[model samples]
Target: QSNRELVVDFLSYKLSQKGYSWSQMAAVKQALREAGDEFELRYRRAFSDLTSQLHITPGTAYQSFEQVVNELFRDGVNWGRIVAFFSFGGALCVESVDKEMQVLVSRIAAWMATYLNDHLEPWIQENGGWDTFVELYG
Candidate 1:
Protein backbone atom coordinates (compact mmCIF):
# COMPACT_ATOMS: atom_id res chain seq x y z
CA GLN A 1 0.00 0.00 0.00
CA SER A 2 2.97 2.32 0.61
CA ASN A 3 6.37 2.62 -1.05
CA ARG A 4 8.06 1.33 2.11
CA GLU A 5 5.70 -1.58 2.32
CA LEU A 6 6.19 -2.30 -1.35
CA VAL A 7 9.95 -2.41 -0.98
CA VAL A 8 9.63 -4.69 2.02
CA ASP A 9 7.29 -7.06 0.19
CA PHE A 10 9.49 -7.18 -2.86
CA LEU A 11 12.59 -7.92 -0.83
CA SER A 12 10.78 -10.53 1.23
CA TYR A 13 9.49 -12.21 -1.92
CA LYS A 14 12.96 -12.29 -3.42
CA LEU A 15 14.52 -13.67 -0.25
CA SER A 16 11.91 -16.41 -0.06
CA GLN A 17 12.50 -17.49 -3.67
CA LYS A 18 16.23 -17.47 -2.98
CA GLY A 19 15.57 -19.93 -0.13
CA TYR A 20 16.44 -17.84 2.85
CA SER A 21 15.54 -19.38 6.22
CA TRP A 22 12.33 -18.26 7.84
CA SER A 23 14.13 -16.45 10.65
CA GLN A 24 16.25 -14.38 8.29
CA MET A 25 13.21 -13.51 6.20
CA ALA A 26 11.32 -12.54 9.30
CA ALA A 27 14.12 -10.25 10.40
CA VAL A 28 14.04 -8.52 7.04
CA LYS A 29 10.25 -8.28 7.15
CA GLN A 30 10.42 -6.70 10.58
CA ALA A 31 13.06 -4.26 9.45
CA LEU A 32 10.95 -3.24 6.47
CA ARG A 33 7.79 -2.90 8.51
CA GLU A 34 9.51 -0.71 11.06
CA ALA A 35 11.67 1.15 8.50
CA GLY A 36 8.71 3.13 7.17
CA ASP A 37 8.56 5.18 10.33
CA GLU A 38 11.83 4.34 12.05
CA PHE A 39 13.97 5.56 9.19
CA GLU A 40 11.94 7.79 6.94
CA LEU A 41 14.60 10.47 7.20
CA ARG A 42 17.33 7.95 6.40
CA TYR A 43 15.30 6.82 3.40
CA ARG A 44 15.15 10.43 2.27
CA ARG A 45 18.93 10.60 2.45
CA ALA A 46 19.20 7.42 0.36
CA PHE A 47 16.89 8.92 -2.22
CA SER A 48 19.18 11.93 -2.41
CA ASP A 49 22.24 9.73 -2.92
CA LEU A 50 20.51 7.86 -5.73
CA THR A 51 19.43 11.00 -7.54
CA SER A 52 22.64 13.00 -7.02
CA GLN A 53 24.58 11.38 -9.87
CA LEU A 54 22.46 12.32 -12.87
CA HIS A 55 25.08 14.49 -14.61
CA ILE A 56 25.90 12.89 -17.98
CA THR A 57 29.18 12.68 -19.87
CA PRO A 58 29.99 10.75 -23.03
CA GLY A 59 33.06 8.77 -21.83
CA THR A 60 31.50 8.21 -18.41
CA ALA A 61 28.19 7.22 -20.00
CA TYR A 62 29.96 4.64 -22.15
CA GLN A 63 32.11 3.32 -19.31
CA SER A 64 29.11 3.24 -17.00
CA PHE A 65 27.66 0.67 -19.39
CA GLU A 66 30.98 -1.07 -20.13
CA GLN A 67 32.62 -1.49 -16.72
CA VAL A 68 30.57 -3.97 -14.66
CA VAL A 69 30.45 -7.15 -16.72
CA ASN A 70 34.06 -6.44 -17.60
CA GLU A 71 35.41 -5.74 -14.12
CA LEU A 72 37.56 -8.54 -12.63
CA PHE A 73 38.77 -9.40 -16.12
CA ARG A 74 40.25 -5.95 -16.47
CA ASP A 75 43.58 -4.97 -14.89
CA GLY A 76 43.15 -1.90 -12.73
CA VAL A 77 42.83 -1.34 -9.02
CA ASN A 78 39.70 0.68 -8.18
CA TRP A 79 39.06 1.68 -11.77
CA GLY A 80 37.98 -1.79 -12.85
CA ARG A 81 35.69 -2.31 -9.89
CA ILE A 82 34.08 1.12 -10.03
CA VAL A 83 33.59 0.89 -13.78
CA ALA A 84 32.05 -2.52 -13.62
CA PHE A 85 29.51 -1.34 -11.06
CA PHE A 86 28.35 1.35 -13.46
CA SER A 87 28.34 -0.79 -16.61
CA PHE A 88 26.27 -3.66 -15.24
CA GLY A 89 24.11 -1.41 -13.12
CA GLY A 90 23.07 0.41 -16.27
CA ALA A 91 22.65 -2.79 -18.29
CA LEU A 92 20.05 -3.93 -15.78
CA CYS A 93 17.93 -1.27 -17.49
CA VAL A 94 18.88 -2.22 -21.04
CA GLU A 95 16.87 -0.43 -23.69
CA SER A 96 14.87 -2.41 -26.24
CA VAL A 97 15.75 0.25 -28.78
CA ASP A 98 19.44 -0.51 -28.32
CA LYS A 99 19.50 -4.16 -27.45
CA GLU A 100 22.82 -4.56 -29.24
CA MET A 101 24.26 -1.74 -27.18
CA GLN A 102 23.13 -3.54 -24.07
CA VAL A 103 25.11 -6.64 -24.94
CA LEU A 104 28.20 -4.53 -25.48
CA VAL A 105 28.81 -4.67 -21.71
CA SER A 106 30.21 -8.17 -21.95
CA ARG A 107 31.91 -7.44 -25.24
CA ILE A 108 33.74 -4.47 -23.79
CA ALA A 109 34.83 -6.51 -20.78
CA ALA A 110 36.30 -9.19 -23.01
CA TRP A 111 37.81 -6.63 -25.32
CA MET A 112 39.50 -4.88 -22.40
CA ALA A 113 40.78 -8.18 -21.06
CA THR A 114 42.37 -9.05 -24.37
CA TYR A 115 43.54 -5.55 -25.08
CA LEU A 116 45.19 -5.24 -21.67
CA ASN A 117 46.80 -8.66 -21.91
CA ASP A 118 48.22 -7.95 -25.34
CA HIS A 119 48.88 -4.24 -25.16
CA LEU A 120 48.91 -2.57 -21.76
CA GLU A 121 49.95 -5.63 -19.82
CA PRO A 122 53.30 -5.78 -21.54
CA TRP A 123 53.65 -2.03 -21.49
CA ILE A 124 52.90 -1.83 -17.82
CA GLN A 125 55.41 -4.55 -17.10
CA GLU A 126 58.16 -3.09 -19.20
CA ASN A 127 57.81 0.67 -18.80
CA GLY A 128 55.51 1.12 -15.84
CA GLY A 129 58.22 -0.47 -13.60
CA TRP A 130 55.75 -3.05 -12.34
CA ASP A 131 56.66 -6.71 -11.93
CA THR A 132 53.57 -8.52 -13.18
CA PHE A 133 51.43 -5.44 -13.80
CA VAL A 134 48.36 -7.22 -12.50
CA GLU A 135 49.70 -7.22 -8.96
CA LEU A 136 50.26 -3.51 -9.08
CA TYR A 137 46.58 -2.91 -8.89
CA GLY A 138 45.68 -5.94 -6.80
Candidate 2:
Protein backbone atom coordinates (compact mmCIF):
# COMPACT_ATOMS: atom_id res chain seq x y z
CA GLN A 1 0.00 0.00 0.00
CA SER A 2 0.99 3.61 -0.49
CA ASN A 3 2.37 5.69 2.38
CA ARG A 4 -0.70 7.88 2.49
CA GLU A 5 -2.91 4.84 2.68
CA LEU A 6 -0.83 3.51 5.56
CA VAL A 7 -1.04 6.87 7.35
CA VAL A 8 -4.78 7.10 6.83
CA ASP A 9 -5.35 3.64 8.22
CA PHE A 10 -2.99 4.32 11.12
CA LEU A 11 -4.65 7.59 12.01
CA SER A 12 -8.09 6.08 11.76
CA TYR A 13 -7.13 3.15 13.95
CA LYS A 14 -5.43 5.37 16.53
CA LEU A 15 -8.17 7.95 16.74
CA SER A 16 -10.91 5.34 16.96
CA GLN A 17 -9.63 4.29 20.37
CA LYS A 18 -9.85 7.84 21.75
CA GLY A 19 -13.60 7.74 22.47
CA TYR A 20 -14.40 10.93 20.56
CA SER A 21 -17.65 11.16 18.64
CA TRP A 22 -17.34 10.43 14.95
CA SER A 23 -17.81 14.06 14.05
CA GLN A 24 -15.28 15.25 16.60
CA MET A 25 -12.76 12.69 15.44
CA ALA A 26 -13.31 13.66 11.84
CA ALA A 27 -12.72 17.32 12.66
CA VAL A 28 -9.55 16.54 14.55
CA LYS A 29 -8.22 14.30 11.79
CA GLN A 30 -8.88 16.99 9.24
CA ALA A 31 -7.08 19.57 11.36
CA LEU A 32 -4.14 17.24 11.79
CA ARG A 33 -3.97 16.52 8.04
CA GLU A 34 -4.00 20.23 7.24
CA ALA A 35 -1.41 21.01 9.86
CA GLY A 36 0.85 18.33 8.43
CA ASP A 37 0.85 20.11 5.08
CA GLU A 38 1.30 23.51 6.69
CA PHE A 39 4.21 22.33 8.76
CA GLU A 40 5.90 20.79 5.73
CA LEU A 41 5.81 24.12 3.99
CA ARG A 42 7.16 25.87 7.03
CA TYR A 43 9.85 23.27 7.47
CA ARG A 44 11.02 23.76 3.92
CA ARG A 45 11.06 27.48 4.45
CA ALA A 46 13.19 27.04 7.55
CA PHE A 47 15.66 24.94 5.61
CA SER A 48 15.90 27.51 2.85
CA ASP A 49 16.35 30.32 5.35
CA LEU A 50 19.17 28.51 7.09
CA THR A 51 20.84 27.69 3.80
CA SER A 52 20.67 31.33 2.77
CA GLN A 53 22.32 32.31 6.04
CA LEU A 54 25.08 29.84 5.41
CA HIS A 55 25.63 31.25 1.96
CA ILE A 56 25.35 34.90 2.91
CA THR A 57 27.11 34.89 6.27
CA PRO A 58 28.64 31.55 6.99
CA GLY A 59 30.90 32.79 9.73
CA THR A 60 28.10 34.17 11.91
CA ALA A 61 25.26 31.71 11.21
CA TYR A 62 26.30 29.41 14.03
CA GLN A 63 26.52 32.30 16.44
CA SER A 64 23.12 33.54 15.37
CA PHE A 65 21.62 30.12 15.94
CA GLU A 66 23.36 29.90 19.29
CA GLN A 67 21.83 33.21 20.33
CA VAL A 68 18.40 32.00 19.27
CA VAL A 69 18.86 28.89 21.37
CA ASN A 70 20.05 30.99 24.27
CA GLU A 71 17.00 33.23 23.96
CA LEU A 72 14.73 30.21 23.99
CA PHE A 73 16.42 28.99 27.15
CA ARG A 74 16.26 32.41 28.74
CA ASP A 75 12.53 32.47 28.09
CA GLY A 76 12.26 29.16 30.01
CA VAL A 77 11.24 27.13 27.00
CA ASN A 78 10.45 23.49 27.71
CA TRP A 79 12.72 20.66 26.62
CA GLY A 80 10.24 19.23 24.12
CA ARG A 81 10.02 22.52 22.27
CA ILE A 82 13.78 22.97 22.22
CA VAL A 83 14.30 19.47 20.85
CA ALA A 84 11.73 20.09 18.12
CA PHE A 85 13.55 23.26 17.08
CA PHE A 86 16.92 21.53 16.93
CA SER A 87 15.49 18.50 15.20
CA PHE A 88 14.22 20.69 12.40
CA GLY A 89 17.73 21.80 11.61
CA GLY A 90 19.10 18.32 12.12
CA ALA A 91 16.63 16.92 9.58
CA LEU A 92 17.70 19.56 7.10
CA CYS A 93 21.30 18.60 7.58
CA VAL A 94 20.50 14.99 6.75
CA GLU A 95 18.77 16.18 3.59
CA SER A 96 21.81 18.13 2.42
CA VAL A 97 25.38 17.25 1.44
CA ASP A 98 26.83 20.64 2.38
CA LYS A 99 29.66 20.45 4.91
CA GLU A 100 28.83 23.78 6.52
CA MET A 101 25.21 22.77 6.93
CA GLN A 102 26.28 19.65 8.75
CA VAL A 103 28.58 21.65 10.98
CA LEU A 104 25.76 24.06 11.78
CA VAL A 105 23.50 21.18 12.66
CA SER A 106 26.18 19.70 14.90
CA ARG A 107 26.58 23.04 16.62
CA ILE A 108 22.85 23.17 17.31
CA ALA A 109 22.93 19.72 18.88
CA ALA A 110 26.03 20.57 20.89
CA TRP A 111 24.46 23.71 22.30
CA MET A 112 21.32 21.85 23.30
CA ALA A 113 23.42 19.21 25.04
CA THR A 114 25.39 21.89 26.86
CA TYR A 115 22.24 23.62 28.02
CA LEU A 116 20.66 20.39 29.22
CA ASN A 117 23.78 19.47 31.14
CA ASP A 118 24.22 22.89 32.70
CA HIS A 119 20.60 23.66 33.57
CA LEU A 120 17.96 21.05 32.78
CA GLU A 121 19.64 17.98 34.30
CA PRO A 122 18.71 18.85 37.86
CA TRP A 123 15.14 19.71 36.97
CA ILE A 124 14.75 16.45 35.05
CA GLN A 125 16.24 14.45 37.93
CA GLU A 126 13.78 15.95 40.38
CA ASN A 127 10.73 15.51 38.17
CA GLY A 128 10.89 11.80 37.23
CA GLY A 129 13.18 12.90 34.44
CA TRP A 130 14.51 11.31 31.28
CA ASP A 131 13.05 7.87 31.92
CA THR A 132 9.53 9.23 32.31
CA PHE A 133 10.01 11.49 29.31
CA VAL A 134 11.05 8.51 27.22
CA GLU A 135 8.17 6.36 28.45
CA LEU A 136 5.64 9.02 27.54
CA TYR A 137 7.33 10.32 24.41
CA GLY A 138 9.75 7.71 23.17
Candidate 3:
Protein backbone atom coordinates (compact mmCIF):
# COMPACT_ATOMS: atom_id res chain seq x y z
CA GLN A 1 0.00 0.00 0.00
CA SER A 2 1.00 3.61 -0.40
CA ASN A 3 2.24 5.39 2.72
CA ARG A 4 -0.82 7.58 3.06
CA GLU A 5 -3.11 4.62 2.58
CA LEU A 6 -1.20 2.66 5.16
CA VAL A 7 -1.57 5.44 7.67
CA VAL A 8 -5.26 5.81 6.99
CA ASP A 9 -5.89 2.12 7.30
CA PHE A 10 -3.96 1.81 10.51
CA LEU A 11 -5.61 4.81 12.11
CA SER A 12 -9.08 3.72 11.06
CA TYR A 13 -8.52 0.32 12.61
CA LYS A 14 -7.07 1.77 15.78
CA LEU A 15 -9.84 4.35 16.21
CA SER A 16 -12.48 1.75 15.53
CA GLN A 17 -11.10 -0.27 18.41
CA LYS A 18 -11.53 2.86 20.49
CA GLY A 19 -15.22 2.95 19.43
CA TYR A 20 -15.26 5.69 16.83
CA SER A 21 -18.15 5.55 14.36
CA TRP A 22 -18.09 6.44 10.69
CA SER A 23 -18.71 10.11 11.36
CA GLN A 24 -15.98 10.25 13.96
CA MET A 25 -13.68 8.34 11.67
CA ALA A 26 -14.31 10.92 8.98
CA ALA A 27 -13.28 13.66 11.35
CA VAL A 28 -10.19 11.70 12.35
CA LYS A 29 -9.26 11.17 8.72
CA GLN A 30 -9.42 14.88 8.03
CA ALA A 31 -7.46 15.64 11.14
CA LEU A 32 -4.83 13.11 10.17
CA ARG A 33 -4.43 14.67 6.75
CA GLU A 34 -4.06 18.13 8.18
CA ALA A 35 -1.68 16.76 10.79
CA GLY A 36 0.45 15.12 8.12
CA ASP A 37 0.86 18.44 6.38
CA GLU A 38 1.72 20.26 9.56
CA PHE A 39 4.11 17.55 10.64
CA GLU A 40 5.90 17.58 7.34
CA LEU A 41 6.29 21.29 7.59
CA ARG A 42 7.21 21.67 11.26
CA TYR A 43 8.09 18.49 13.15
CA ARG A 44 11.83 18.66 12.73
CA ARG A 45 12.09 22.07 14.33
CA ALA A 46 9.59 21.08 16.97
CA PHE A 47 11.61 18.00 17.81
CA SER A 48 14.74 20.10 18.03
CA ASP A 49 12.98 22.47 20.41
CA LEU A 50 11.83 19.54 22.52
CA THR A 51 15.29 18.09 22.64
CA SER A 52 16.60 21.40 23.85
CA GLN A 53 13.95 21.71 26.53
CA LEU A 54 14.44 18.19 27.88
CA HIS A 55 18.21 17.98 27.48
CA ILE A 56 17.62 14.89 25.45
CA THR A 57 20.47 12.72 24.30
CA PRO A 58 20.25 10.51 21.23
CA GLY A 59 20.32 7.41 23.41
CA THR A 60 17.55 8.72 25.68
CA ALA A 61 14.81 9.10 23.12
CA TYR A 62 12.27 7.08 25.04
CA GLN A 63 12.92 9.01 28.22
CA SER A 64 12.51 12.22 26.27
CA PHE A 65 9.20 11.01 24.87
CA GLU A 66 7.95 10.09 28.33
CA GLN A 67 8.92 13.44 29.75
CA VAL A 68 7.35 15.46 26.94
CA VAL A 69 4.11 13.49 26.92
CA ASN A 70 3.84 13.75 30.69
CA GLU A 71 4.20 17.49 30.38
CA LEU A 72 1.58 17.64 27.63
CA PHE A 73 -0.89 15.70 29.83
CA ARG A 74 -0.76 18.41 32.45
CA ASP A 75 -2.39 20.81 29.99
CA GLY A 76 -5.85 19.21 29.73
CA VAL A 77 -7.92 16.54 28.04
CA ASN A 78 -10.52 16.26 25.32
CA TRP A 79 -11.08 13.98 22.34
CA GLY A 80 -9.82 16.54 19.85
CA ARG A 81 -6.73 17.32 21.89
CA ILE A 82 -5.89 13.69 22.27
CA VAL A 83 -6.29 13.31 18.53
CA ALA A 84 -3.73 16.04 18.02
CA PHE A 85 -1.34 14.36 20.43
CA PHE A 86 -1.51 11.08 18.61
CA SER A 87 -1.22 12.79 15.26
CA PHE A 88 1.87 14.62 16.43
CA GLY A 89 3.51 11.35 17.33
CA GLY A 90 2.48 9.86 14.02
CA ALA A 91 3.98 12.75 12.15
CA LEU A 92 7.07 12.53 14.25
CA CYS A 93 7.42 8.89 13.38
CA VAL A 94 7.16 9.59 9.69
CA GLU A 95 9.76 12.32 9.87
CA SER A 96 12.06 10.23 12.02
CA VAL A 97 11.88 7.43 9.50
CA ASP A 98 13.28 9.76 6.86
CA LYS A 99 16.24 10.54 9.10
CA GLU A 100 16.98 6.98 10.15
CA MET A 101 15.61 7.57 13.61
CA GLN A 102 13.11 4.74 13.46
CA VAL A 103 13.76 3.69 17.02
CA LEU A 104 12.76 7.12 18.27
CA VAL A 105 9.65 6.95 16.15
CA SER A 106 8.65 3.63 17.68
CA ARG A 107 9.31 4.91 21.16
CA ILE A 108 7.05 7.92 20.64
CA ALA A 109 4.28 5.87 19.08
CA ALA A 110 4.55 3.21 21.79
CA TRP A 111 4.29 5.84 24.51
CA MET A 112 1.20 7.33 22.88
CA ALA A 113 -0.48 3.93 22.55
CA THR A 114 0.29 3.04 26.11
CA TYR A 115 -0.95 6.37 27.41
CA LEU A 116 -4.18 6.15 25.44
CA ASN A 117 -4.90 2.60 26.51
CA ASP A 118 -3.81 2.84 30.14
CA HIS A 119 -4.70 6.38 31.14
CA LEU A 120 -7.12 8.00 28.70
CA GLU A 121 -9.34 4.97 28.12
CA PRO A 122 -10.47 4.78 31.73
CA TRP A 123 -10.98 8.52 31.99
CA ILE A 124 -13.01 8.47 28.80
CA GLN A 125 -15.10 5.62 30.14
CA GLU A 126 -15.83 7.65 33.25
CA ASN A 127 -16.65 10.76 31.26
CA GLY A 128 -19.33 9.00 29.23
CA GLY A 129 -17.10 7.20 26.76
CA TRP A 130 -16.72 7.39 22.97
CA ASP A 131 -20.41 7.78 22.31
CA THR A 132 -20.48 10.94 24.36
CA PHE A 133 -17.28 12.13 22.73
CA VAL A 134 -18.83 11.67 19.30
CA GLU A 135 -22.01 13.43 20.39
CA LEU A 136 -19.91 16.40 21.41
CA TYR A 137 -17.16 16.24 18.80
CA GLY A 138 -18.49 14.49 15.70
Best by TM-score: 3
Q: Write the per-residue lDDT of candidate 2 for residues 49-134, one digit (tens) a residue.
A: 54444331235555565555565467665545444445544554554435445555555567556766766678777767645543
Which residue pairs show backbone clashes in model 1? 64-87, 67-84, 68-84
| RMSD of every prediction | 14.2, 9.4, 7.0
- For model 3, what is the error of residue 129's alpha carbon versus the real structure, in angstroms, after optimal superposition? 1.9
Better of 1 and 2 by TM-score: 2
Compared with the true structure, the alpha-carbon lDDT of candidate 2 equals 0.52
**Which portions of model 1 show Cα errors greater than 4 Å?**
1-100, 128-138
| Candidate 1: residue 29 lDDT (0-100) | 40
For candidate 2, the per-residue lDDT at 67 reads: 59
- How far off is residue 68 in model 1, in Å? 22
Model 2 TM-score (2 dp): 0.42
> Each candidate's TM vs. the true structure?
0.24, 0.42, 0.54
lDDT per residue (tens digit) for residues 20-54 in model 3: 63455565455555544555466667645533444
